[PDB]
Write a protein that binds this ligand. Structure first.
Ligand SMILES: [Ca+2]
Ligand SMILES: [Ca+2]
Ligand SMILES: [Ca+2]
Ligand SMILES: [Ca+2]
Ligand SMILES: [Ca+2]
Ligand SMILES: [Ca+2]
Ligand SMILES: [Cl-]
Ligand SMILES: [Cl-]
Ligand SMILES: [Cl-]
Ligand SMILES: [Cl-]
Ligand SMILES: [Cl-]
Ligand SMILES: [Cl-]
Ligand SMILES: [Cl-]
Ligand SMILES: [Cl-]
Ligand SMILES: [Cl-]
Ligand SMILES: [Cl-]
Ligand SMILES: [Cl-]
Ligand SMILES: [Cl-]
Ligand SMILES: [Cl-]
Ligand SMILES: [Cl-]
Ligand SMILES: [Cl-]
Ligand SMILES: [Cl-]
Ligand SMILES: [Cl-]
Ligand SMILES: [Cl-]
Ligand SMILES: [Cl-]
Ligand SMILES: [Cl-]
Ligand SMILES: [Cl-]
Ligand SMILES: [Cl-]
Ligand SMILES: [Cl-]
Ligand SMILES: [Cl-]
Ligand SMILES: [Cl-]
Ligand SMILES: [Cl-]
Ligand SMILES: [Cl-]
Ligand SMILES: [Cl-]
Ligand SMILES: [Cl-]
Ligand SMILES: [Cl-]
Ligand SMILES: [Cl-]
Ligand SMILES: [Cl-]
Ligand SMILES: [Cl-]
Ligand SMILES: [Cl-]
Ligand SMILES: [Cl-]
Ligand SMILES: [Cl-]
Ligand SMILES: [Mg+2]
Ligand SMILES: [Mg+2]
Ligand SMILES: [Mg+2]
Ligand SMILES: [Mg+2]
Ligand SMILES: [Mg+2]
Ligand SMILES: [Mg+2]
Ligand SMILES: [Mg+2]
Ligand SMILES: [Mg+2]
Ligand SMILES: [Mg+2]
Ligand SMILES: [Mg+2]
Ligand SMILES: [Mg+2]
Ligand SMILES: [Mg+2]
Ligand SMILES: [Mg+2]
Ligand SMILES: [Mg+2]
Ligand SMILES: [Mg+2]
Ligand SMILES: [Mg+2]
Ligand SMILES: [Mg+2]
Ligand SMILES: [Mg+2]
Ligand code: NA
Ligand code: NA
Ligand SMILES: [Zn+2]
Ligand SMILES: [Zn+2]
Lengths: 594, 594
């Protein structure tokens, strides 16, 4: 339980994976998404005493052979006895012994096991020697990437040492490390070591279930790179994996050299990751340059949250291979409409249902502006689907435009023929009335961006929006008295604050004849309400006051708080009213520079 | 000071290095061994308001050209104006601009600066374009290892992004990142970008001050590897560095292919480390496999605690080069006596002063057993230096023996002809009377180990040590009565507890005639005091009770506490008395199995 020299053997619940370590102060952390059942006992070689907590007493060390029995491997001991390796590891020298546990021998192929028991003198001794090193090497001495010649024919032992502490030999993890023996050190490993493969390329060419994948490799000329030296991690999709793909998609990706090359590189890692090195979620950069998320649930390895791994830890000379049930497809190999996620499904479905899906050709370059599913209300989907189709046509571009390519004042051409204004702010980018969210992606034939609202290009100008509402009438007169009608009719970029007639009625119309006498002061009072450029409340960062220079030249302050626009610390009635040449914010009272 | 949108510009005290970041909650940490002077001001574009803490107000963004002046680069602005780049970066598009600060232009070579002012239309525009990217890329979008084509002739911009947050372009660090502009983003870099070198090999061959180093490379055939693609960090020793070496050492290392190859690889890193990425101490694995410790003191880069770096951040296509004043010599390229550290100096000096230094040949393989300087007392160095030389001859072996090659019961042959017994325990390794410390190293021609005490091979056997002290007399008789004289005379491994005659006098000699009648019980009582194998108190782990099986078969317990051996929880008088065939522990009372 607790005390000196107490060792804890953890087993991940629902799995056969076991971790042995000294009982420290903090190891109740769960591994691979599951908690563990712990088994407390004296560390091997240590003994309990009467009336004493823990195991204060220790037994003298033995040689490597006796240590095999000390660490709990009876089967490795017996095979060492039958092959007459016992007398070597009891004798003079220094030996590191990587000893499969009893379970590890149980999991060995029965024909291979009886095949080793068939010849004890040669084959069994050669395998056990393949498990050994000519000098004593503790776990700290086993460094990631080391290739250590074994005691049989100088067979390479491929060492991996990971930040989490996992140490593996040919991807076999060391459960119980550093058992000190007079003759050397004994480590217990979770599997029996096997002959190393020629290379990843040779395994792909030799394997029939990789027949599909192999083909694609030869098309991308990336198979030759997998036959040279290195440390790789290859997730190999099986024939089942390619047959699980939608019809024609594999043909379309194979027909394109860039899509095939990127697809291939997306399955490869530049480092050697054994399955036993994964205790949880992590991100790895593939050779394509996008990252895959590798994790574990129980004993099942997960890739991008899905568990595709059936056969794992196939160790070759140049790296490790894990078989997967699916095909990892990077965004760079995907058609644009395939870049959409969960929150775009409605959009993704609508363009498919209303006949715009076929309109995105593989030979073209397109941009999807995709409102989230929350941006489609019931009243929206209640409209006649042909008007809805016209609205969706404003969300598709016939040119690919990346998020890094956008700029303020840019105009985009929808496939529906209309024009979208781009407004770039410091913290936000808003196309027409709708502003972008995070999560833009770029595919093979185009790019996709995500919007909070449905994009509705403004059909009416400033002047038209002014003369169509009665509450603005007086103000419009003043704007026409200022000779600003031509500005309100013609295109441009403007931010206009419109006081309602309710604001002029606060002056009881007598200040209208008072200020009607001033020709110059009317120009100041009016021009203070107009600012160059379009500034909408959705684009501001919340809580921040915005200092803008009006066309009158005096400063005006715009602060969006709780999705409510405040102009000079006065709450606006209506805000963000989009026109063709500008934006309108309706205010309660008449504005003065002050 | 404090508030919203407050930005802090730190300057490392005693250096011109500057770091700009938003005022967060914790950045008072010192950089590169020194504290910083901080300058608080509103983040560019943000403004103070009356009665408000911090800078709650923000100004609208400008284009890239205006942002140059916003971020504080007037010189980049002026050069952009003179080359007519201004009208491009004020216009339509999306531009990332890496803008040298004013200081960065000041540090540019005056002939290069006036040389750019000489032609504004072509050369200046081509350099400024070499500082720019065709799309907007924030610092998070700049990934380590990226090569991004610039806007002049698709010149590669080599991006590096380090865990500490440092982002560099051609090793130029970005002081102020992510200034958002309508036309793109502006980053401020600490130096003017320059033409990238052909490769590291080409720079070595072109440089005369590397003439020495270049030669060694061609001898090790590692120069061709430095001409291929990759990301490297090369610390290049100058001609001064090789001339600073002891005479004949460079010739000896060059004459040996393994020493030269390891020496060369020890100067190379497999990753690109810019000088500006170093905020403090870190360890890096070289191509030789040993690690070098890289750090910084002020603006001086340190390697292995020494500051050898004068010229730094020489950027080529395949990596970076930093010039060093010394030659990094790995242990694998060193002669054995050169492996000694500070605490071995006395030993290192003694073998040199008494004539044993020349006795270690480059053609041989040797092992040094080196006591720490504290292991030489005044009385030790007061003895005649020829006897001292005989003692040192027991500390040298004519065969190389690694720490991983040692095993219990091994016998070593000193060059002085004597023989050393090796005792391997679980937590300790003791040669004869002295036990090993940490810090063993392996060199080219041998290995070195560190000991707490001077090794003194035992000259007397158990029987001789017994009959030469009177206090043991009675006990010796009993041992001879048990027919154990032949065991005490002949070689072996034994642990013997010797009760003094003071213990038998506690029985008043009447129990000597009482127990003298029993022939069988005397064998038990006597044989309980003898155990097979040599167990010394220095080798035990402190506080741990040791269960040993005596040659009588009953258990005995040995616990070393406060450097005092306790046998069955009884403090021994004298402990760890070394003989040829065993060890003697003197006890106060007679021992019984109980
Ligand atoms: Ca370790
Ligand atoms: Ca175990
Ligand atoms: Ca704007
Ligand atoms: Ca960042
Ligand atoms: Ca700055
Ligand atoms: Ca021993
Ligand atoms: Cl489970
Ligand atoms: Cl541990
Ligand atoms: Cl947990
Ligand atoms: Cl137990
Ligand atoms: Cl035990
Ligand atoms: Cl070896
Ligand atoms: Cl672990
Ligand atoms: Cl371990
Ligand atoms: Cl050993
Ligand atoms: Cl992990
Ligand atoms: Cl998703
Ligand atoms: Cl339809
Ligand atoms: Cl994008
Ligand atoms: Cl891009
Ligand atoms: Cl933005
Ligand atoms: Cl309307
Ligand atoms: Cl327009
Ligand atoms: Cl003002
Ligand atoms: Cl300093
Ligand atoms: Cl920041
Ligand atoms: Cl500090
Ligand atoms: Cl300020
Ligand atoms: Cl400012
Ligand atoms: Cl580009
Ligand atoms: Cl930083
Ligand atoms: Cl930064
Ligand atoms: Cl932009
Ligand atoms: Cl650092
Ligand atoms: Cl030192
Ligand atoms: Cl001498
Ligand atoms: Cl060593
Ligand atoms: Cl070695
Ligand atoms: Cl040890
Ligand atoms: Cl003596
Ligand atoms: Cl001996
Ligand atoms: Cl007992
Ligand atoms: Mg043992
Ligand atoms: Mg076993
Ligand atoms: Mg491995
Ligand atoms: Mg396949
Ligand atoms: Mg594994
Ligand atoms: Mg949607
Ligand atoms: Mg009105
Ligand atoms: Mg507009
Ligand atoms: Mg608003
Ligand atoms: Mg700006
Ligand atoms: Mg400047
Ligand atoms: Mg760089
Ligand atoms: Mg040189
Ligand atoms: Mg740098
Ligand atoms: Mg010394
Ligand atoms: Mg006696
Ligand atoms: Mg002995
Ligand atoms: Mg002692
Ligand atoms: Na012991
Ligand atoms: Na703004
Ligand atoms: Zn303005
Ligand atoms: Zn024993």
């Amino acid at each position: 339980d607790q005390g000196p020299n107490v060792c804890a053997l953890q087993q991940i619940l629902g799995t056969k994976k076991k971790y042995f370590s000294t009982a420290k102060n903090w190891y109740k952390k769960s591994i691979c998404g599951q908690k563990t059942t712990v088994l407390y006992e004296c560390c091997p070689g240590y003994m309990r005493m009467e009336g004493m907590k823990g195991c204060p007493a220790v037994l003298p060390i033995d040689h490597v052979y006796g240590t095999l029995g000390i660490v709990g491997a009876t089967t490795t001991q017996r095979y060492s006895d039958a092959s007459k390796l016992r007398e070597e590891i009891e004798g003079k020298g220094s030996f590191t012994y990587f000893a499969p546990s009893n379970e590890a021998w149980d999991n060995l192929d029965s024909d291979i096991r009886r095949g080793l028991e068939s010849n004890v003198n040669v084959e069994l001794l050669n395998a056990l020697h393949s498990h050994m090193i000519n000098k004593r090497m503790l776990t700290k001495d086993l460094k990631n990437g080391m290739i250590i010649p074994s005691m049989y024919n100088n067979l390479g032992l491929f060492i991996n040492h990971y930040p989490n502490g996992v140490v593996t030999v040919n991807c076999a993890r060391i459960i119980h490390g550093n058992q000190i023996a007079t003759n050397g050190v004994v480590h217990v490993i979770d599997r029996v070591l096997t002959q190393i493969g020629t290379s990843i390329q040779d395994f792909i060419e030799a394997e029939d279930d990789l027949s599909s994948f192999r083909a694609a490799a030869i098309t991308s000329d990336i198979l030759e790179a997998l036959g040279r030296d290195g440390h790789f991690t290859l997730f190999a999709p099986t024939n089942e994996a390619f047959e699980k793909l939608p019809r024609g998609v594999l043909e379309r990706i194979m027909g394109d050299k860039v899509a095939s090359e990127a697809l291939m590189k997306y399955h490869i890692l530049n480092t050697l990751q054994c399955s036993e090195s994964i205790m949880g979620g992590a991100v790895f950069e593939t050779l394509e340059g996008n990252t895959i998320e590798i994790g574990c649930d129980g004993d099942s390895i997960t890739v991008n949250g899905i568990k595709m791994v059936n056969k794992k830890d196939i160790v070759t000379n140049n790296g490790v291979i894990h078989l997967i049930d699916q095909v990892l497809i990077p965004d760079s190999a995907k058609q644009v409409i395939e870049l959409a996620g969960k929150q775009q499904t409605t959009f993704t479905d609508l363009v498919a249902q209303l006949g715009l899906a076929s309109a995105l050709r593989p030979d073209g370059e397109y941009t999807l502006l995709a409102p989230v599913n929350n941006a489609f209300s019931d009243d929206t989907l209640s409209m006649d689907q042909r008007l809805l189709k016209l609205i969706l046509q404003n969300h598709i571009l016939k040119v690919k435009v990346g998020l890094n390519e956008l700029y303020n004042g840019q105009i985009l051409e929808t496939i529906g023929g209309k024009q979208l204004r781009v407004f770039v702010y410091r913290t936000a980018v808003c196309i027409e009335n709708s502003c972008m969210e995070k999560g833009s992606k770029q595919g093979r034939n185009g790019a996709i961006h995500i919007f909070r609202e449905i994009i509705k290009p403004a059909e009416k100008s400033l002047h038209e929006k002014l003369k169509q509402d009665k509450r603005f009438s007086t103000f419009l007169s003043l704007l026409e008295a200022a000779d600003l009608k031509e500005l309100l009719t013609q295109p441009g970029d403007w931010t206009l604050f419109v006081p309602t007639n309710d604001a002029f009625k606060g002056m009881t119309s007598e200040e209208k004849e008072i200020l009607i006498r001033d020709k110059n002061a009317l120009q100041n009072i009016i021009l203070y309400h107009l600012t160059p450029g379009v500034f909408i409340g959705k684009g501001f960062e919340p809580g921040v006051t915005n200092i803008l220079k009006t066309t009158q030249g005096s400063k005006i302050f715009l602060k969006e708080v709780n999705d409510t626009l405040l102009v000079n610390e006065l709450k606006s009635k209506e805000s963000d009213i989009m026109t063709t040449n500008g934006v309108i914010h309706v205010v309660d009272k008449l504005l003065y520079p002050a």
